[PDB]
């Protein structure tokens, strides 16, 4: 009988995985403070990795990689890409970004203004976005907005030429769920989601952020055409792939998926030596939410990586069951056609 503990009651994902584990009749849930467990569905923040792997006779497994925050932090990802030779500063799939500390607190204030002035002088599109959201084409507004705050921000180039879906003339992003097991195999969930903007993209007005921000919470709160083109401003791969064939005479795999799979491998292989639990006294796996942008040249850009992602309501069952198969049962077997795509690589 396998035992597990739940230490994040707010996870819509692992609440299902926990719901499935008990459904097998071979997993027993313990109190959140019981140390004699096989599997910890741990808390997001300040997870005590130092207390794992010290219970005699117990093989212990946790659903977070200690150190993956370097990838899932706005500022961290920027520093990692610039300072990692595997990614270099000329990384062709990550928008030009700069880490900027508020003046009331290294920092890249002058480096940003150097590249900004260069663009202003060369008649080139010079619109940036600040987040940790304000979109503007003036460096004065972007920096003054960060000083009014008290945390670290990041200013990156705003994709002024996004790929717009028709009809609607609207922006969007792509969410990809990635699962990394204890052996550090990279599995890409075959089902993705496009979080589309239900408003027409407008380049002459960055004041109204409803057509520029494809967040599911901003569309369902500040957009007046929510749910018009697709249910809940969510288009799935089948429909999106069909649109690409009809409108662009190409495929989702060829035009975008190859770039997504490349970006996922590059980010995860880069930090493998720092977070791998191969020879560690405990084991780790984790589910990631990669957010991508697609420009009008069908080039894919990386927006950020989420370490504690949610799922699309229609895909919880399939993805959650898949987590139990490759991540949990692979280490704690029970008494297809995989839903994932294994991204082979050298360890």
């Amino acid at each position: 009988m396998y035992t597990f503990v739940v230490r994040d009651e707010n996870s819509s994902v692992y609440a299902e995985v926990s719901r499935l584990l008990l459904a097998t009749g071979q997993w027993k849930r313990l109190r959140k403070d019981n140390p004699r467990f096989n599997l910890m569905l741990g808390e997001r923040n300040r997870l005590p990795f130092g207390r794992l792997g010290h219970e005699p006779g117990l093989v212990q497994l946790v659903n977070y990689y200690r150190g993956a925050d370097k990838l899932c932090r706005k500022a961290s990802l920027v520093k990692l890409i610039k300072t990692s030779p595997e990614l270099s500063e000329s990384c062709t799939w990550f928008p030009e970004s700069y880490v900027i500390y508020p003046t009331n607190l290294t920092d890249e204030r002058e480096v940003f203004l150097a590249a900004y002035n260069r663009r202003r002088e060369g008649r080139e599109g010079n619109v940036w976005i600040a987040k940790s959201i304000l979109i503007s084409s003036e460096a004065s507004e972007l920096l003054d907005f960060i000083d009014e705050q008290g945390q670290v921000h990041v200013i990156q180039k705003y994709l002024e030429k996004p790929l717009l879906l028709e009809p609607g003339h609207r922006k969007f992003d792509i969410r990809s769920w990635v699962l990394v097991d204890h052996l550090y195999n990279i599995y890409l969930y075959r089902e993705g989601v496009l979080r589309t903007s239900s408003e027409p993209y407008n380049s002459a007005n960055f004041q109204d952020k409803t057509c520029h921000l494809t967040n599911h919470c901003i569309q369902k709160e500040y957009s007046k055409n929510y749910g018009r083109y697709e249910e809940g401003n969510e288009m799935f791969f089948e429909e999106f792939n069909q649109y690409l064939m009809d409108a662009l005479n190409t495929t989702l795999e060829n035009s975008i998926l190859l770039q997504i799979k490349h970006i996922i491998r590059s980010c995860l292989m880069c930090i493998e030596p720092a977070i791998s639990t191969k020879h560690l006294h405990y084991q780790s796996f984790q589910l990631f939410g990669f957010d991508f942008m697609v420009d009008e040249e069908l080039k894919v850009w990386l927006i950020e990586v989420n370490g504690a992602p949610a799922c699309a309501q229609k895909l919880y069952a399939e993805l959650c069951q898949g987590i139990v198969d490759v991540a949990i049962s692979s280490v704690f077997p029970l008494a297809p056609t995989s839903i994932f795509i294994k991204l082979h690589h050298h360890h």
Partner: protein, 425 residues
């Protein structure tokens, strides 16, 4: 040289004590006359813990036999190993205690306790370094119960910093001599709460059920019951009587088994308990699952009704020490809802290579469980059923006791139950 002084008082105490010395004398290779005839040096390694060495390479138990009537101790002297005991160590009267706690504790017993303490003092004076004392007795009678707890009280006064352990038989209506046993047991339990460091609670009802249902004994006798207690006493003292990485004296044992001074009442257990399919080799999984089974426990308490504060298992015989950890680590990590989570690593295991007589291997269980509250609950209920009508009290008031002392004994044990109840949540 960490010597233990053994005291056995009353009928039950001396009959269980006799069988105990019979069992361990065999394990250490001591014949009925005190001469060693073993084949392994492990038998003599820790022999001086329970035995003195006299002239002629003779080994004499460090045992003091006490009773208020002669009968039982004449049977011991005529018993199998009767001649092995020091003649001076028989201390007995003629009046008897009449199953009366007040006679053992206040009248008859007081007349004899000083001569018993003279013998204890003598055995202690010849000890290189006394570990402590152990007393075998029943709580339902008069001598073991009333005089037993008087001896403990006076031993603690003279040896305040020595360990005092007891094997205490708890009365049961199913195996009862008189109706006043709940009175005698309630009065003794308070004495034990205050003046013992470890009390092994042996319930006569559990011993009976094991004989009838498990051992398939149609008509169990006191002898049959005492066969289970001998084996159990031999198991709980294995670590003291033989070498091994465990080491441990009485105090180090108490320090790790008793988290709170009043909650020092233990549930002992033994495996195997085979009926006569008796030659079948018992694997380590079977030993472990049986040892943790309630049917194998002698406190007549369901552990699944409470929580283990601390557990200690002792495995005897040549077996896989890796497989012992695997099965033990399996019973914990498969029933962790019955172990308190605020005493880390509260399940400990020890191995001894020498098995009991006629057994390839065995396992002895020592649990400090809050479920033991069910035993004191039963006693309290039987006490109250009679005390509410002052039934049978004249036997005690006739010995000078007041009703107030019964009310206090009642309030004390109900307190004890309440103390177990708060740590069970």
């Amino acid at each position: 040289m960490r010597e233990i002084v053994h005291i056995q008082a009353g009928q039950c105490g001396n009959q269980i004590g006799a069988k105990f010395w019979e069992v361990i004398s065999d394990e250490h290779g001591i014949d009925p006359t005190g001469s060693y005839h073993g084949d392994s040096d492990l038998q003599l390694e820790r022999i001086n813990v329970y035995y003195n060495e006299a002239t002629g390479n003779k080994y004499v138990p460090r045992a003091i036999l006490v009773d208020l009537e002669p009968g039982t101790m004449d049977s011991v002297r005529s018993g199998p190993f009767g001649q092995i005991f020091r003649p001076d160590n028989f201390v007995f009267g003629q009046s008897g205690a009449g199953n009366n706690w007040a006679k053992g504790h206040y009248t008859e017993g007081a007349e004899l306790v000083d001569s018993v303490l003279d013998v204890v003092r003598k055995e202690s004076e010849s000890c290189d370094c006394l570990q402590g004392f152990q007393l075998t007795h029943s709580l339902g009678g008069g001598t073991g119960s009333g005089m037993g707890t008087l001896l403990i009280s006076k031993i603690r006064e003279e040896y305040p910093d020595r360990i005092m352990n007891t094997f205490s038989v708890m009365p049961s209506p199913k195996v009862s001599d008189t109706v006043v046993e709940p009175y005698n047991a309630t009065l003794s339990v308070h004495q034990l709460v205050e003046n013992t460091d470890e009390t092994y609670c042996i319930d006569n009802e559990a011993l009976y059920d094991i004989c009838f249902r498990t051992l398939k004994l149609t008509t169990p006798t006191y002898g049959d019951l005492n066969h289970l207690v001998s084996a159990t006493m031999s198991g709980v003292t294995t670590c003291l009587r033989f070498p091994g990485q465990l080491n441990a004296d009485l105090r180090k044992l108490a320090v790790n088994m008793v988290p709170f001074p009043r909650l020092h009442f233990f549930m002992p257990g033994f495996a195997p308990l085979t009926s006569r399919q008796q030659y079948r080799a018992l694997t380590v999984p079977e030993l472990t699952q049986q040892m943790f089974d309630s049917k194998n426990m002698m406190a007549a308490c369901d552990p699944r009704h409470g929580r283990y504060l601390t557990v200690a298992a002792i495995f005897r015989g040549r077996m896989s020490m890796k497989e012992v950890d695997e099965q033990m680590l399996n019973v914990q990590n498969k029933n962790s809802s019955y172990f308190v989570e605020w005493i880390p690593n509260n399940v400990k295991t020890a191995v001894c290579d020498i098995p009991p007589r006629g057994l390839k291997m065995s396992a002895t269980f020592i649990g400090n469980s809050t479920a033991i509250q069910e035993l004191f609950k039963r006693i309290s209920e039987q006490f109250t059923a009679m005390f509410r009508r002052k039934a049978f009290l004249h036997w005690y008031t006739g010995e000078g006791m007041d009703e107030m002392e019964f009310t206090e004994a009642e309030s004390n044990m109900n307190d004890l139950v309440s103390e177990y109840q708060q740590y069970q949540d």
